[PDB]
Amino acid sequence: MNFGIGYGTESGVSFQAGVQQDNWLGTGYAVGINGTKNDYQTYAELSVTNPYFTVDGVSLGGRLFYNDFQADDADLSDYTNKSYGTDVTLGFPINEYNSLRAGLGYVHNSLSNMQPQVAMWRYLYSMGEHPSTSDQDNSFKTDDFTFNYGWTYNKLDRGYFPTDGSRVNLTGKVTIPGSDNEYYKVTLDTATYVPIDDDHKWVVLGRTRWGYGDGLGGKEMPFYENFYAGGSSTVRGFQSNTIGPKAVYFPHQASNYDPDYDYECATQDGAKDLCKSDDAVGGNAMAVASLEFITPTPFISVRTSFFWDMGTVWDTNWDSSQYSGYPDYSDPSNIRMSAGIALQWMSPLGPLVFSYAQPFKKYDGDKAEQFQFNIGKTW
């Protein structure tokens, strides 16, 4: 057994619990069973990895998983995704700094409890489903097969508090024939550390993250695969996932009751017409960047930095023309920005990270959150 418990502004309190024998039972294979609990998510998996499936070091890995996601608790417009699936992946260690992955996946998604909103229904209609707008009672089920690939470059001088070098991670996916959805997603992550002194105590860190995905044959990318921005790990000073399009709600009713006094963003109690909102729904395109300046810590294993984060998320399929009475969510030029201080501490109780930041470029509906932190401990 091994454990992990954590607390932070992003995800509330996290519980990890699993067993993973690194050699099993002396076969060379590594097998593991693993579970997670979040404010918004409960994940479980059995994994199996033959790390010397070839003598060069070509690994062969398998994963079987279940995931339960509640979008409301992630500060998103409301839906539930109960999914499960499998992956089998080849890994190629081309050298000490680069590895390659290629794999096949299967995933079952089943959506329920979707609050009717424009972006979500536009996807639904593109799949030939015609649900009503009066209902938050709805269900949509899909099964997909994917081809998955990836490259990771890593020449960081150190793991935890790097001082020099860079890391790059490209991850891509596309549906293969036989799937209900037809789409591709690509993601690019970048981190590069540049020291400006000999003792390597002053370091400039530059980060970027890019994501683009879209439908292939008249279909749209499912919203449950959208990108998000704004929180501790992306652009600080903003509440988790607030950056980008906001749900535009249909006039509505209630799922099994309809009392007061809380919620109901487009309640029939007072409804006529479409409701603008501050619920984030994510996007199929994304760009975040960061430049930060790492300094010795006054006055005392622990790292402090001054940072400038910035980001955007948009909806390339948002019909600007038909929804001209609402904000242009297809517009990529709404770059949000922030500035702040961060302190990290690999402490005896476990890793500690804290930050204080000021959103100085903001847009209507963006929820600010200037103090963000994360605490953790593992058994």
UniProtKB/Swiss-Prot annotation:
Q: What does this protein do?
A: Part of the outer membrane protein assembly complex (Bam), which is involved in assembly and insertion of beta-barrel proteins into the outer membrane. Constitutes, with BamD, the core component of the assembly machinery. Efficient substrate folding and insertion into the outer membrane requires all 5 subunits. A lateral gate may open between the first and last strands of the BamA beta-barrel that allows substrate to insert into the outer membrane; comparison of the structures of complete and nearly complete Bam complexes show there is considerable movement of all 5 proteins. (Microbial infection) Acts as a receptor for CdiA-EC93, the contact-dependent growth inhibition (CDI) effector of E.coli strain EC93; antibodies against extracellular epitopes decrease CDI. Its role in CDI is independent of the other Bam complex components. Is not the receptor for CdiA from E.coli strain 536 / UPEC, which does not have the same mode of toxicity as CdiA from strain EC93; the decreased expression of bamA101 in some experiments decreases the level of outer membrane proteins in general.
Which residue spans belong to the Periplasmic compartment? Answer: 22-29, 51-58, 82-97, 153-165, 195-203, 347
Q: Does the keyword Membrane apply?
A: yes
Listed name of the protein: Outer membrane protein assembly factor BamA
Q: Which domain of life does the protein's organism represent? A: Bacteria
Instruction: Tell me which UniProt keywords the record has, alphabetically.
Output: Cell adhesion, Cell outer membrane, Membrane, Repeat, Signal, Transmembrane, Transmembrane beta strand
- The organism of origin for this protein: Escherichia coli (strain K12)
Which parts of the chain span the membrane according to its record? Answer: 2-8, 11-21, 30-37, 41-50, 59-70, 80-81, 98-110, 139-152, 166-175, 184-194, 204-214, 284-293, 302-314, 337-346, 348-358, 373-377
**Gene Ontology CC entries for this record:** Bam protein complex; cell outer membrane; membrane
Q: What happens when the gene is disrupted?
A: Deletion is lethal. Depletion results in the accumulation of incorrectly assembled outer membrane proteins, including TolC, OmpF, OmpC and OmpA. Decreased expression leads to decreased susceptibility to contact-dependent growth inhibition (CDI), and decreased expression of outer membrane proteins (including in this study LamB) as well as up-regulation of periplasmic protease DegP.
- Can you say where in the cell this protein is located? Cell outer membrane
Q: Which residues lie on this side of the membrane: Extracellular?
A: 9-10, 38-40, 71-79, 111-138, 176-183, 215-283, 315-336, 359-372
Instruction: Describe the protein's quaternary organization and the partners it interacts with.
Output: Part of the Bam complex, which is composed of the outer membrane protein BamA, and four lipoproteins BamB, BamC, BamD and BamE. BamA interacts directly with BamB and the BamCDE subcomplex. The Bam complex has the shape of a hat, with the BamA beta-barrel crown in the outer membrane and the periplasmic brim formed by the BamA POTRA domains and the 4 lipoproteins.
| Domain-level remarks | Contains 5 N-terminal periplasmic polypeptide transport-associated (POTRA) domains which interact with other subunits of the complex, may recruit substrates from the periplasm into the outer membrane and also act as a chaperone. The C-terminal region forms a discontinuous 16-stranded beta-barrel transmembrane region. The central pore is ellipsoid, and probably closed by extracellular loop 6, perhaps with the aid of other loops.
- Give the GO terms filed under biological process for this record: cell adhesion; Gram-negative-bacterium-type cell outer membrane assembly; protein insertion into membrane
The protein's gene is named bamA
What changing residue 309 to A does, per the record, is:
Slow growth on solid and liquid media, less protein accumulates which is more proteinase sensitive
Q: Does the keyword Signal apply?
A: yes
What's the family?
Belongs to the BamA family.
- Effect ascribed to mutating residue 233 to C: No effect. Lethal
Q: What is its main location?
A: membrane
